[PDB]
């Protein structure tokens, strides 16, 4: 019995006795993700290089992928009639949906995560977090300022060697592989769980001169294990979505702590940290700033940044122990 | 006008007034790469998950991507009637083409580089090097034991966010993007040249405990610039093809030195180091083991390994100076 | 506001306050149609011709398209958990769905209509009719023996120059174009209505020697109009789905009356005639055997055949007038 | 082994030791056809219906398929540097290629045959004929006014249930199926030969009132066989490319004789009749106006029309005997 994302979302909606907005919202996200994936794989690029001459395009139309991905998500999400407030990594202000297309959900997303990797063709993706409108007053950015703990759904689409959508909800994380031949997401891994301990650490060591003492000690242990065990392997794709997905399926730890230029970390809380922390916790993993659970942070700005350490429980707990140690004084 | 890979190779073939055997070889390579890309992107995966029931399957047809990639390259290259000897990262022995389909070219290739990144969907690719048989004796593995400097063509196909084929030849390096909508590689970057100096270093620091003093000094310098400039950023996808491609388009340096487990380096000379070194040099970059030019090494084993350092001239040269410094003490 | 089939089916389900089975059933049909379309367009045929050699397929697996289409519909429909009885043009007996996957709907379908056109690559398609389980006793073929008038939904997917799905339900016919780049059916024509009168007649005139007097007279009028108006144009693709679709969008008339070898017509009532008659009537057209409305016929066999004349109201009414004339005696 | 169109043309080019200009011309044609097929199948249509909002569009970029097909062929053929004169069914005047991209071949083509079938999604296609410039004078339309017998290559691409390219050359007719998954034409039928006698006749009988006595007698014979055998079945898709392809693979006969509106026949000699006549004769079939061989007609107008009868030898010959009979009374 093959299960598609459409059938999965549909069934989860019935068992939850929902009106249907969530189901319509997730269906729309699915459609947006497929449209972004096709664009990312460069389908139709021949037209941009004049295969049919230049009789159609009479003006600027060469949209960058990150801009195009943003337009697809915003437009497709709006046409779902299930959202009221949208927060995008590419927009300064929150987007308030017209009354005519207004729904009950708040969506925070990162249209094309891994900007620096776009031009070198390295894996990139889309990250999303979904909240249910809390207050009863007019929708505003405030509706997006909820602790990740309030998330009803979160996940990401990875445009890697293949395109995969990872969806996390109250009862677990499920992985769907996109079959581009039929434009259908196929459930390939249900109720995913991260391993208790991995053997890979992921972090940009270029900021070494600015790491706090705990991060410094932890990395030293990965390379020169005090107990003489085997050193961990290192991997840093440069796109959060790619490094986090590898962490989920292979185990290990991912880190982006604070540094000189980024005193409160670089990654954004609403559409990078929280969605990933939610997926991680639903998979049996941990996500911390090194001092507190990411999902417990109360956002004060829609573009707020936060340090983040996530991955296998035992690996993240070891780092937390080091932070506690350097705080005991 | 628009230039497809097919027209590019055809044209280049006519320029050097060739019999067309090399042209057919490149055409076949193009076909193999497109076929591998389609499989990598998981087209038709729905059938494996029973969309059409379990009536189609009759045995145990569950070929892993790496085995499929190897079968595709081998079968397609043989069908080109342009090769006599094939060396694959997946085969312990060189493959001697039957007399009927025998051609004069020797091809060394890595069907699906980035084995550890296959399951986590991170970028992977195909690497190839082409030599002309320089002998009259019956074809044997010895025909593949030529220094990289003898290559007539080399390159790789990167199955990342998009699929790109990079081809280096005597005249230079050119990049073609695969437009999956029409199955055609489109020339998008002519006579590519790498930046003289970059700002990214790429290495698996998990082997820090095993690096020689030169590698160690260089890495420290990247994190703690003596001139107090901004430290280099770090990136290590884990797939040579992906890290090297980024090195080529963004500049910087890629390293895989020797360590305890790999005293002679891990990467293989014939289908990993040589092809990438040739692409690098044709692009104005450098490729060294730290003590000699990769392309000058005369191999004695088709699966010979070698340490490798490649990338922007100034960056590689800086590391070479550290090596030369220690050897002068 | 772009509308996809998924969103259309979802909304129609909500407005109807249905449990969700219909929506799941239509979603499944959508998925099956995309899988058949990709196969029909021959994606992956290179593998059948040995592009990767012959290492996987160790036995028979070269399924004919008509057989494959049948497996996809049956399997996908079953996994919807919304059906109890299935009638296929390719199966002698009705298919009774397992209690575990049993739903309330009865589906009659023609997996790949236009058998004679399969090998010459002329347009072919899939036709479907959906009934709601009436009786309360165990499901049997009897549940499929309902007059077309009881249909809750019907339509077809045309695999022509492009793939299109036409869906007819209680309040109208809607046309969805499949965008293969994203595997998404896009609503392109809503609440379709056939023109009152067309200028094209479609019938296999090869059976002329066996046509009844009314058909003979009608065809004579199309070629030699008694009032000297312009003669009608003739078109007969040979695939009912193609000829009927053209009739719907261009207007005119389609005919397949009785003949020597086919005394009660050739087309089957449950999965060819009724579905098309329903689409036609919902579009403001007519569908008759020449003596009675197709949708009013009470089926006595699941593979019962029936003569059928359908299309623009004025064109079909003219033929009915001729039948009445030749019956007045 | 597996043979792609690219390898087939390349090989054939080497056999006749050509400079490779014809090879590049065929390669370009292959690219144009794949691009047309993708558009015909409606890839990316979702963008036209606002999936990404209305920010991409800036003017009135709504090119109809026929105009797009014409722009693709023209642009791609010019980019081949192998042509000097182009004749399109869509252009009133012959297109003379600029001196820079000038080659020695003259190409006559029908970019999207079956205009009336475009909107109803019935099979459509591209027809082409290639001549070598036989003169030293500056290229002009006169170079395209050669009898079909001078063709060096001709064929068509049928965008039906699947996309197939049929190529005829001095040595024979070969059929290649387009595998859209990898964008490659695969040889699936070598040295095709039409059946000596068929069982299908194809003509628009709507012009019955205007047919000459020979056509009328022949059709009556197909419906009322004097030998009392089974009558021929009828088929008329309405797109020459589709009806002719079926004629080639199933045998039988295709006819488009003169009528009141088209006293010299409707189909055009240079890009409809000649290409199909050449394919037919290379396949062992016949092509006549009823009074002379189509390939022997020396045109005086690039848009010259001609009556045409083509298909299985015995069938065509039977009709010719009727013509000869009347001319002998
Ligand atoms: O270059 P560094 O500092 O490593 O930052 C990379 C991180 O920033 C992000 C932020 O989105 O990439 P980027 O800034 O290139 O968009 C994450 O995807 C990634 O984890
Ligand atoms: O895991 P480490 O030791 O970093 O090795 C990674 C390197 O080895 C290679 C060799 O192919 O990957 P892998 O062994 O996983 O196939 C290169 O692609 C890559 O650069
Ligand atoms: O060959 P004739 O007698 O015209 O029959 C064609 C009709 O039969 C059908 C029945 O499905 O095709 P076919 O028998 O080739 O499958 C219809 O699609 C079509 O309308
Ligand atoms: O409509 P009728 O007169 O049958 O003409 C159909 C013939 O004309 C052509 C000419 O191209 O179609 P069309 O005019 O619709 O483009 C042929 O494809 C086809 O065989
Ligand atoms: Zn991001
Ligand atoms: Zn490798
Ligand atoms: Zn049928
Ligand atoms: Zn035409």
Check residue B237 and give left, alpha or beta (phi > 0: left; psi -120 to 50: alpha): alpha
Q: Residue B288: which of B270, B299, B274, B302 has the closest Cα? A: B274
SS3 letters across chain A: CCCEHHHHHHHHHHHCCCCCHHHHHHHHHHHHHHHHHHHHCCCCHHHHCCCCCCCCCCCCCCCCHHHHHHHHHHHHHHCCCCEEEEEECCCCCCEECCHHHEEEEEEEEEEEECHHHCCCCCCEEEEEEEEECCCCCCCCHHHHCCCHHHCCEEEEEEECCCEEEEEEECCEEEEEEEECCCCEEEEEECCCCCCCCCCEEECCHHHHHHCCHHHHHHHHHHHCCCCCCCCCEECECCCHHHHHHHHHHHCCEEEECCCCCCECECCEHHHHHHHHHHHHHHCCCEEECCCCEHHHCCCCCCCCECCEEEECHHHHHHHHHHHHHCCCC
Alpha-carbon distances of B52 from A254, B30, B47, B49, rounded to whole Å: 39, 31, 6, 9
Which residues in chain B are contacts of C101 at CB distance < 8 A?
none
Q: Any catalytic annotation for residue B113?
A: yes
Task: Tally the domains of chain C.
Answer: 2
Rounded to a whole number of angstroms, the distance from the CA of D21 to the nearest CA of chain B is: 10
- The reply to whether A3 and A126 lie within a common domain is yes
Q: Residue D282: which of D115, D156, D121 has the closest Cα? A: D156
- Check: CB of residue D127 under 8 Å from CB of residue D148: no
Residue numbers of A annotated as active site: 60, 66, 89-90, 110, 112-113, 272
Cα D301 from chain centroid? Answer: 18
User: From B100, which residue of chain D is nearest by alpha-carbon distance?
Assistant: D1
Adjacent-strand bridge partners of C172: C169
Reduce the DSSP state of residue B243 to 3 states and report it.
helix
CATH number at residue D296: 3.40.190.80
CATH number at residue C35: 3.30.540.10
Reduce the DSSP state of residue D26 to 3 states and report it.
helix
Q: What is the DSSP letter of B23?
A: H
Q: Any catalytic annotation for residue B292?
A: no
Chain B CB within 8 Å of residue D28 CB? yes
Query: Number of Cβ pairs closer than 8 Å across B and D?
Result: 79
Most distant pair of Cα atoms in chain D: their distance:
71
What is the extent of the structural domain holding D89?
1-191
**Does the distance separating the beta carbons of C4 and A24 come in below 8 Å?**
no
A323 is in an annotated binding site: no
* Distance in angstroms (rounded) separating the CA atoms of residues A102 and B151: 62
Q: Any catalytic annotation for residue B71?
A: no
Reduce the DSSP state of residue B159 to 3 states and report it.
strand
- Check: CB of residue B107 under 8 Å from CB of residue B86: yes
Which of C148, C167, C191 delimits the end of a domain? C191
Decide whether any atom of ligand 2 lies within 6 Å of the B240 Cβ: yes
Q: Is the dihedral of CA D300, D306, D311, D312 positive or negative?
A: negative
Reduce the DSSP state of residue B7 to 3 states and report it.
helix
Residues 6+ apart with CB under 8 A from D294: D148, D269, D273, D274, D277, D287, D288, D306, D308, D310
- The reply to whether A154 and A167 lie within a common domain is yes
Ligand 3 mutation target, pool C66, C157, C238, most atoms within 8 A of CB? C238
Which residues in chain D are contacts of A53 at CB distance < 8 A?
71, 74-75
The side-by-side arrangement of strands in the sheet containing D105-113 is D95-96, D83-88, D105-113, D124-132, D153-159, D163-169, D172-179, D184-189
Q: Which of C23, C34, C182 sits opposite A10 (nearest CB)?
A: C23
Experimental method: X-ray
Label residue B92 exposed, middle or buried (CB < 10 Å: 0-12, 13-18, 19+).
Answer: exposed
Task: Strands of chain C (E only): list them.
Answer: 83-88, 95-96, 105-113, 124-132, 153-159, 163-169, 172-179, 184-189, 200-202, 233-234, 253-256, 286-288, 308-311
Cα three-residue angle A132-A138-A144, rounded to 5 degrees: 40
For testing the chain C interface, which of B38, B52, B66, B126 should be mutated: the one with the most C CBs within 10 Å?
A: B52
Residue-wise burial string across D304-318, b where 16 or more C-beta atoms lie within 10 A, e elsewhere: bbbbbbbbbbebbee
Which residues in chain B are contacts of C74 at CB distance < 8 A?
53
Chain B CB within 8 Å of residue C41 CB? no
Which residues in chain B are contacts of C31 at CB distance < 8 A?
51
* Distance in angstroms (rounded) separating the CA atoms of residues D125 and D275: 13
Adjacent-strand bridge partners of A265: A263
Please tell me the residue having the least CA distance from ligand 2 atom 1. B238
- The reply to whether D145 and D100 lie within a common domain is yes
- The reply to whether A211 and A138 lie within a common domain is no
- Check: CB of residue A154 under 8 Å from CB of residue A129: yes
Nearest atom within ligand 4 for CA of residue D262: 3
Rounded to a whole number of angstroms, the distance from the CA of D59 to the nearest CA of chain A is: 7
User: From B45, which residue of chain C is nearest by alpha-carbon distance?
Assistant: C35
- The reply to whether A7 and A55 lie within a common domain is yes
* Distance in angstroms (rounded) separating the CA atoms of residues A9 and C202: 44
Which residues in chain C are contacts of B71 at CB distance < 8 A?
52-53, 55
* Distance in angstroms (rounded) separating the CA atoms of residues D164 and A305: 55
Structure tokens given for D174: 């070969």
- The reply to whether D160 and D220 lie within a common domain is no
Unique residue bearing structure tokens 């097909």: D69
Chain D CB within 8 Å of residue C126 CB? no
Pocket of ligand 3 (CB under 6 A): C 113-116, 204, 238-240, 256, 266; D 233
Which of C172, C191, C210 delimits the end of a domain? C191
- The reply to whether D180 and D230 lie within a common domain is no
* Catalytic annotation, pick one of D5, D26, D86, D110: D110
- The reply to whether A160 and A207 lie within a common domain is no
Which of C191, C222, C255 delimits the end of a domain? C191
Rounded to a whole number of angstroms, the distance from the CA of B1 to the nearest CA of chain D is: 6
Q: Residue A184: which of C3, C31, C36 has the closest Cα? A: C31
Resolution of this PDB entry, in A? 2.0
Q: Which C residues in the span 160-179 are in contact with D, Cβ-Cβ below 8 Å? A: 160-164, 177-179
Q: Break chain B down into helix, strand, coil percent, rounded to 5.
A: 35, 25, 40
- The reply to whether D177 and D314 lie within a common domain is no
Unique residue bearing structure tokens 């084995």: B115
Q: What is the DSSP letter of D244?
A: H
* Helix H or strand E encompassing D83: strand D83-88
Could you give the count of Cα atoms lying within 13 Å of D28 in the half-sphere of its Cβ?
Answer: 30
Structure tokens given for A275: 């969605």
Q: What is the DSSP letter of B63?
A: -
Between β-strands B95-96 and D105-113, what pairing exists: parallel, antiparallel or unpaired?
unpaired
- The reply to whether C173 and C208 lie within a common domain is no
- The reply to whether D20 and D57 lie within a common domain is yes
* Distance in angstroms (rounded) separating the CA atoms of residues A142 and B269: 58
- The reply to whether C238 and C263 lie within a common domain is yes
Label residue C170 exposed, middle or buried (CB < 10 Å: 0-12, 13-18, 19+).
Answer: exposed
CA of D259 to the centre of ligand 8 (A): 17
Please tell me the residue having the least CA distance from ligand 1 atom 12. A114
For testing the chain B interface, which of C28, C30, C38, C52 should be mutated: the one with the most B CBs within 10 Å?
A: C52
End-to-end CA, chain B:
57
Decide whether any atom of ligand 4 lies within 6 Å of the D262 Cβ: no
């Amino acid at each position: 019995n093959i299960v598609t994302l459409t059938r999965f979302v549909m069934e989860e909606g019935r068992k939850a006795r929902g009106t249907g907005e969530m189901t319509q919202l997730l269906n729309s996200l699915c459609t947006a993700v497929k449209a972004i994936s096709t664009a990312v794989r460069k389908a139709g690029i021949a037209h941009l290089y004049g295969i049919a001459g230049s009789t159609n395009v009479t003006g600027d139309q060469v949209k960058k992928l990150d801009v195009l991905s943003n337009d697809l998500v915003i437009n497709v999400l709006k046409s779902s009639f299930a959202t009221c407030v949208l927060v995008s990594e590419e927009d300064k202000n929150a987007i308030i949906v017209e009354p005519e297309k207004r729904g009950k959900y708040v969506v925070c997303f990162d249209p094309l995560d891994g900007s620096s990797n776009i031009d070198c063709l390295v894996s990139i993706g889309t990250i999303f977090g979904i909240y249910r409108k809390n207050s009863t007053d007019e929708p505003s950015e405030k509706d997006a300022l909820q602790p990740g703990r309030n998330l009803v759904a979160a996940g990401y689409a990875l445009y890697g060697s293949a395109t995969m959508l990872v969806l996390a909800m109250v009862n677990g994380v499920n992985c769907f592989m996109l079959d581009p031949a039929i434009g259908e997401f196929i459930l390939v891994d249900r109720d995913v769980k991260i391993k208790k301990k991995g053997s890979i650490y992921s972090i940009n060591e270029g900021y070494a001169k600015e790491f706090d003492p705990a991060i410094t000690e932890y990395i030293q242990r990965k390379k020169f294990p005090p107990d003489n065990s085997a050193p961990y392997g290192a991997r840093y794709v440069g796109s959060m979505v790619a490094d986090v997905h590898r962490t989920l399926v292979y185990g290990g730890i991912f880190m982006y702590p604070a540094n000189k230029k980024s005193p409160k970390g670089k990654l954004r809380l609403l559409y990078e940290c929280n969605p990933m922390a939610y997926v991680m916790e639903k998979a049996g993993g941990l996500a911390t700033t090194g001092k507190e659970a990411v999902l417990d942070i109360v956002p004060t700005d829609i573009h707020q940044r936060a340090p983040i350490i996530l991955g296998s429980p035992e690996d993240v707990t070891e780092l937390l122990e080091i932070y506690q140690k350097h705080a005991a004084k």
